[PDB]
Amino acid sequence: DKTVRWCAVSEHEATKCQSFRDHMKSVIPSDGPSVACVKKASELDCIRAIAANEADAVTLDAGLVYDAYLAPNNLKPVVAEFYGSKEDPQTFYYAVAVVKKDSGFQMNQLRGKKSCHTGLGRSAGWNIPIGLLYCDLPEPRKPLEKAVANFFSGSCAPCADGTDFPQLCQLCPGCGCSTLNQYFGYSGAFKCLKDGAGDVAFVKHSTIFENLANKADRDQYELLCLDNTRKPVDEYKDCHLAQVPSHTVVARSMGGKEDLIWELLNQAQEHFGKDKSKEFQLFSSPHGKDLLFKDSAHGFLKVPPRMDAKMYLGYEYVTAIRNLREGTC
């Protein structure tokens, strides 16, 4: 029963945040918790702000959860999104590589292609695909951006430094790290492919389904599998790059209001979860896709007491991330 300062990244998320706040007021008693909205330019800024006691919560892709746990931020995950359905919640998802039908190349022929990424340091759009191509990348592999810029003949990697690596923002000038960059995120990375700027988009299994309603439109796309073959977008379970942890809401390790955060989100998913309301929806919005939370999420699950980021992500994934900034071949 106090205020939770939610960190909204840019204009769109801010708008949804304002709606979230108002609708919650109309249904949460006077002794219930409330939402306040803080607008930031990026997720990176949100991490700082929470650590500096300027905000209290923000949902992050598991890839960014690692950087949020690192000093001097020291944030911890408190609430996780789950996908699939309520009967059988999936606390993970599939990273896939989407391409257009008959484009003519396999996984082993990516050098020279144009790639569309959700964002720098993110699970599906960066960490996984780059981790798999790592050794096939040219040297030096430090900084990593360098190698990626030289592997592909241009790409869109939101949040990257366009000054230092201009090839990385070739498909999306500036490399905007928010929805203001139309090619940002899952659906942004997909549009980058659909519009014809890129040859491959690294997103999740639900992305194409979230964007193309007709099975006939989806039939014009395919998935690149690790065995250098292609498969239909609905056969992602046999044709994906990896399984990664679900997105999660992070908070301060000290005086982080984890109790209020859970109390709020739990009431939120009950009143405005999937199919629960005509006035407001927590997992969709006329203002855009994946705002504040993923459209593909069906609810939340409280993370076990005082769990750290390494434990949440898993040693295998943590290990994958570490090598990404070091590794040999």
Instruction: Write down the H helix ranges in the chain.
Output: 10-25, 43-51, 62-69, 128-133, 144-151, 185-194, 207-211, 215-218, 258-272, 309-313, 315-324
CB 208 within 8 Å of CB 289 = no
61 marked among binding-site residues: yes
Per CB under 5 A, the segment of 121-129, 146-154, 163-171, 195-203 that binds Fe ion is: 121-129
122 marked among binding-site residues: yes
Least distance (Å) from Fe ion to the CB of residue 166?
26
Q: In what order do the strands lie in the sheet with 297-302?
A: 58-60, 248-252, 75-83, 297-302
Least distance (Å) from Fe ion to the CB of residue 122?
6
* Position with the least CB separation from Fe ion: 61
213 marked among binding-site residues: no
Per CB under 5 A, the segment of 55-63, 106-114, 172-180, 298-306 that binds Fe ion is: 55-63
Q: What angle do CA 156, 159, 160 make, to 5 degrees?
A: 65
Structure tokens at 82: 């789950």
72 prior amide bond cis, ω within 30: yes
Per CB under 5 A, the segment of 61-69, 231-239, 252-260, 270-278 that binds Fe ion is: 61-69
Among 45, 56, 61, 199, interactor with Fe ion by CB under 5 A: 61
Q: Using the rule CB under 5 A, is 206 a contact of Fe ion? A: no
Whole-angstrom Cα distance, residue 263 to residue 299?
Answer: 13
Q: Which of 241, 236, 237 is nearest to 123 (CA)?
A: 241
Per CB under 5 A, the segment of 46-54, 59-67, 163-171, 210-218 that binds Fe ion is: 59-67
Minimum CB distance to Fe ion smaller for 56 or for 61: 61
Least distance (Å) from Fe ion to the CB of residue 119?
9
CB 172 within 8 Å of CB 183 = yes
186 marked among binding-site residues: yes
Residues within window 264-303 making contact with Fe ion, judged by CB under 5 A: none
Among 73, 123, 170, 179, interactor with Fe ion by CB under 5 A: 123
Strand-pairing partners, residue 302, are: 79
Residues annotated within a binding site for hydrogencarbonate: 118, 122, 124-125
Binding site for Fe ion (CB under 5 A): 61, 123
